[PDB]
């Protein structure tokens, strides 16, 4: 049984989550916790863009989080989110995902939170998004498919027809020889991993 709360100034962007019982996902508009008739301001020390104010975040997380909560904060500067992370988080009772926008969230939000709950700043990959929402969708998908009750690269897969546009399915896959099929698939996976992800086998990246 898992509860996921997602906090964002763009709740509309989290709608793809509908595409249950073991898990509940709830999306909260951060602006719900503002008192004035702005969630951001210029950075101390200077620099381009805006930083999200800690005040609004503090009030939201105060209401949503408990000491048992795992607070997840997507950020390009985070620890890497990997399959290992997904397995680890798959047995959590309560994930709260704080989605930033602009140039990110005042660092004190995570620091304050860490005084009463576990906090994980994470990156989903070495590219830059406009905000945390797409990363939340990735994290939710990767985690939920591992929830109870729900290395090397995978090689190529094939299905019918056995010949298509003059391209034939590798004959071994039609042979019904499980050992020969297992061996060919291993070789394909090895080949693919060396070519595309040599780092996985402890070799230099291109």
Residue numbering of the annotated binding site: 74, 100, 123-129
Residue ranges of E strands in 112-165 = 118-123, 163-164
Shortest Å, Cβ 22 to a copy of itself: 15
**For ligand JCH, which residue has the nearest CB?**
100
194 lies in the binding site for a copy of itself (CB under 8 A): no
- CA 72 vs. chain centroid, Å, equals 10
44 lies in the binding site for ligand JCH (CB under 6 A): no
Which ranges in 66-177 belong to alpha helices (H)? Answer: 83-89, 107-114, 133-144, 172-175
Known binding-site residue numbers for S-adenosyl-L-homocysteine: 74, 100, 123-125, 127, 129
197 lies in the binding site for a copy of itself (CB under 8 A): yes
| The one segment of 9-17, 106-114, 129-137, 166-174 that binds ligand JCH by CB under 6 A | 129-137
| The one segment of 28-36, 69-77, 90-98 that binds a copy of itself by CB under 8 A | 69-77
54 lies in the binding site for ligand JCH (CB under 6 A): no
- Secondary structure of residue 92 in the 3-state scheme: coil
| C-beta atoms surrounding 77 within 10 Å | 8
80 lies in the binding site for a copy of itself (CB under 8 A): yes
| The one segment of 26-34, 65-73, 90-98, 137-145 that binds a copy of itself by CB under 8 A | 137-145
Which ranges in the chain belong to alpha helices (H)? Answer: 54-64, 83-89, 107-114, 133-144, 172-175, 178-196
147 lies in the binding site for a copy of itself (CB under 8 A): no
Q: Which one among 94, 112, 117, 147 touches a copy of itself, defined by CB under 8 A? A: 112
Shortest Å, Cβ 60 to a copy of itself: 14
32 lies in the binding site for a copy of itself (CB under 8 A): no
Residue 119, burial from CB neighbour count under 10 angstroms (0-12, 13-18, 19+): buried
- The whole-angstrom separation of Cα 64 and Cα 51 is 22
Cβ-proximal residues to 74 (8 Å cutoff; 6+ apart), any chain: 97, 98, 99, 100, 121, 122, 123, 124, 129, 132, 135, 136, 139
Residues in touch with ligand JCH (CB under 6 A): 74-76, 100-104, 123-125, 127-132, 135, 154
């Amino acid at each position: 049984s898992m509860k996921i709360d997602v906090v964002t100034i763009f709740p509309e962007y989290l709608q793809p989550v509908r595409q249950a019982g073991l898990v509940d996902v709830a999306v909260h508009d951060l602006r719900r916790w503002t008192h004035d008739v702005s969630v951001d301001d210029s950075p101390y020390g200077g620099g381009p863009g805006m930083v999200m104010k800690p005040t609004v975040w503090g009030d939201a997380l105060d209401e949503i989080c408990t000491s048992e909560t795992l607070l997840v904060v997507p950020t390009p500067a985070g620890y890497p989110f990997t399959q290992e992370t997904a397995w680890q988080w798959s047995t959590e009772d309560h994930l709260v995902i704080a989605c930033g926008r602009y140039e990110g969230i005042d660092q004190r939000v995570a620091d304050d939170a860490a005084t009463r709950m576990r906090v994980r700043e994470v990156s989903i990959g070495d590219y830059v998004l406009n905000g945390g929402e797409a990363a939340a969708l990735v994290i939710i998908e990767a985690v939920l498919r591992l929830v109870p009750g729900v290395s090397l690269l995978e090689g190529p897969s094939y299905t019918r027809p056995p010949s298509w546009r003059g391209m034939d399915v590798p004959p071994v896959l039609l042979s019904g020889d499980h050992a020969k099929i297992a061996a060919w698939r291993a070789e394909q996976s090895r080949q693919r991993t060396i070519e595309r992800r040599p780092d996985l086998l402890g070799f230099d990246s291109p």
